[PDB]
């Protein structure tokens, strides 16, 4: 019943200014955090070889893209390596980022472990040494960073243990990351996997953003300076039921008003599993959805970013800028979508939409 | 991780109309629901006997208040007594407040209890056969509710049982009413009691209603058909530092933006020990502060829209009118304020734009 | 961090004594706290209409059995009508029970209420007025209390919040008996409903007490003073696979040394569905157990004792001490077997074989 | 309310073999896990260089002392680096360990982290990779592990925060362990610093082991496969109030009994800043204590064990003999301790037929 504030006002100051910065109208997330194991499977896809020079090419491509992605791109998460690495001008990649107007992330967690006595639950390794980590990063140019935990939706889970102790560690993460200066994004994922309908991964997603941000609160996580990277409320990637882009958006911003709290600077969307086109629709949608929303809604995404960057690119250095080219179509899309102004086939405000129609009691 | 809804579409549809209707802009709440015991005291101090008859000459005199209260009073709690009292014209009290364009509301828990085993903190009792008598109610015209928990700021209050208690409490509370078409306001009261300042009282209120809002969620709540009653943030009452009405107000609107989820329809403010003049001079202060702010901020006022009118009336039938005067008074006072509209002129403002220096990094 | 003791030492030795009074070694308690709804259909099922008249004679019949009883019956728990009920020869049925050497007790709850939001589960109601209730009946002659939880094994229950709300309940029960110097029993009643096996009972039963006694522990209790009544850990009614005595023995034994701290003073076995012999035969397996058991394992006992008497007596008066020898026979057989000195051999009656077990229809 | 179990049968009993070898009646534990940071100020203390081939002879003195220690030291928790050094004669430290009937332990935490918004408290690192880390110790001749959580007694502490977050990560470190066949030794250790009294300590002790095994069973602890390494319950170390060693034995088994449950194999004490002898005849008092303790109730000393030894051997490996020698002499009276044989002078004693005593409800 007594506080004993975690932070200065000097320190909030500093953290949610970024955390503003991150999500500035008509701004989001470049997620270019895969680890050499994750990135693997995406060379592989286009027969490239999986070195560091290769991946170094491939990042070097994506952040140093033409001054078109510069209103589109608020931050940019790195993997530790590309943190380290240079463009061909000797750049580091961070100093590349920040002429370009974006923040630098760092992903910081070390992947996910096995809850024993669960049904293949998970939880997240990462703390270990995270603050001496953190004050490094942030001398070398991160001004946020990155954790990601797992859930998935299944007969019995996710369980009351998986809930809590990935809410738990997320705060964890979240508290050290602050104490050094550095925006924690928070990311609970609540896979897709299943053929659970809509309203199951609505259910399963307030209950665990309950839990996420009473976490946040008893370790006394500075909401203003952090930011929350979720799934978006979709129905099972096997589900035979189908849903409108709307119902999607309903569902999504109905179990985020639901559970947190305005004094969140910002919700920047991970992409799962959804195509590049599909990401971009729903995050419109979603802006567009007649709910009071007060936290900027827009986009962490990296495979709805890159997906046909990477395919144009082909490992073939002489694909240079056509890749480039597909990577700025991408961000300009969900640009113009975290603004609710983004329409598919055109551009030329030809698309009207729906007011008075549909009751939110059904969500 | 299986839902296994608590309400239907048509139930929800039901509850979130009614807690709107409470709190459509310009109307608060008279909170009249005093007990035989409670109003005791407020009679002895005008000299007038304690009998049935004064305490319903006594509630006739706010409730039939002329037509200038329509558009300022969006509710009133009754006790129990006065839901099946009558005015002199035979209408029952209920179907006056309607007439009026009042929602209709009724006091349920049956007081607070000492907590064993801490110092002197409380629960509060009335969950048996609340579902009955919920029921009851609904059907002799009421369709919102209230129940008092009570905290205390103290050397070792609140603690985490009374916190968690408490919270676990309002939660069965509202859940019951939820099933029953009736809206639970949910009144976490901390007392403005002790000499802990403004930081204190924010630092608990925040604690305080994440564990509310957690305890909702573990009980299935529909926040979008739920109001909450909440102390404003104050220095304790023995404070020694003095804070400005723009202070009060951040730190009101910060707390409230750390933990309330924006599906919460609205927020109505208990005025505690505060006067008449403070209380409306502090909500407009509230309704003016800068920070987005995603529910209603308005009144639940007992003593701050009584107090002159039950002195002024001094238990004499002749005061009548003049009794009514001050209650109109404090009404249209306070109906401006939860606009952010309250000049101490009569109605006269738009001096709207000279704010400047105050940090909500401080806070 | 602080203590602010519930009980003085003098209030701590009342409640430990009379504690181990009940569970005192060869002795266990007689469960006749039957409410009129409860032992309506039983005397239903020997054609005896429910009469005030009827039920106190039932109640004579086996308070006022033979002296040979008496170091059998550590305890009786009575139904609110039955405590101010009197013998024929005008002795008030508390006295009765006090002069054979038995302590009294009272079932305090109010029966259970369906918990919102969850598939088919229940709370249990009776906190309001408890305090004021429970110093009356200590005046009245009552020493321990009796509070009934219900819980079900399922596909999705027991749910956490189940769990969690009926240990929280329990908690407050036991904290208001405590004060008012009655022994509370704890009683956390998983229903046998179901094709489960061992293995899911003993599993659900480990996590259910240890919910309870961290609720216990978050409330203060002092658990020298509570007893808890629990279910044996068994197969579901429905289920096909087949269990020894010494596997149910184990089973049960096991769970509670995983979850009952050794402070706690005694075990007394609710015998849910299971008949006469069942009853007595695993309580039996229980006490030898060769694991160590540092709390009285014991009979709270229902229909496991009453259902060979029910039927002989008929509800014929001149059947009385035929009647009353079923009981004997049964208080005697389990005397032993809380021992574990209890070996059937010649013999017990059919009615003594049949499965006392009904449904539990909320369905 | 589905198991989907951790642990094989096999996997337990290995575990549970393995915990009561450690603790078989007359056994403790030599804890010999330093870090070289932490055994510095010792090895300063005797004006001794802390270098790798000092810290070796130190441990290989104690772990080469002679065969009088073997039925009095069960196991041996040792630091990384003395895991995998070896004696003068080529063995291997943790053959020399086992060839003396020991079990060899390793120290697998990783050092206390600040908890942000708190008043000084800490919680623990350690559990990136931990489940490698364990696996290669098994192979490497370890067979249990010890985990240090550390709480402070003080005018705001420990905090709910503080408590319920070591005793989480308590229970992922025991978790982890149990699936690669290592028996985790918990150990809360609350501090004695302060002017706190006995009561206080008892009060914290019992919160915080009640915490400790709620969080084991929600991450589904096999608790027949653990130990418990616990402060003992006594003043602190600037208590002006005095008390017997009955009293400390008398709080600290109340404090067990109220919050371990009988399935845990054994509490091996911490001795803290306790002397060698007071660390002795206090538990000594606590086996002698009249109350029913259903665990072994024993030492994991390392002060207590080594101070004579470290302060006979002065860095000089001149001193070997009288340096094994005041070792042998503390593991002797730790063993007659554990088993309530020891009295405090020279040799003549025995005449003991003691312990069911006068009080019980003061504590």
Redesign the interface.
Known sequence: ???????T??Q??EL?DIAHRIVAPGKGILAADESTGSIAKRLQSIGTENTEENRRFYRQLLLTADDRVNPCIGGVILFHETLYQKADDGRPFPQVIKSKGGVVGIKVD?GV?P?????GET?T?????L?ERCAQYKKDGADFAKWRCVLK??E??????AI??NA?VLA?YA??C??NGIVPIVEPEILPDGDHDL??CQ??T??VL??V??AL????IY?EGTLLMPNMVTPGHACTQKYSHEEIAMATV?AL???????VTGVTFLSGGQSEEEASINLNAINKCPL???WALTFSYGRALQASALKAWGGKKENLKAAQEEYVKRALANSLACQGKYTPSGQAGAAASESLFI?N??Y
């Open positions: 019943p007594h506080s004993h504030p975690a932070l006002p000097e909030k100051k949610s070390k472990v809850l024993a006595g669960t049904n939880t390794q990462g703390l270990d040494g603050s939706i299944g019995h889970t996710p369980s009351a243990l809590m102790e738990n964890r508290s050290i602050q104490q309203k199951r259910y399963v307030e209950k309950a839990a941000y009473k609160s008893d370790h006394h909401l109905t008003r639901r559970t947190v709290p305005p004094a009071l929303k007060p009751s009691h059904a």
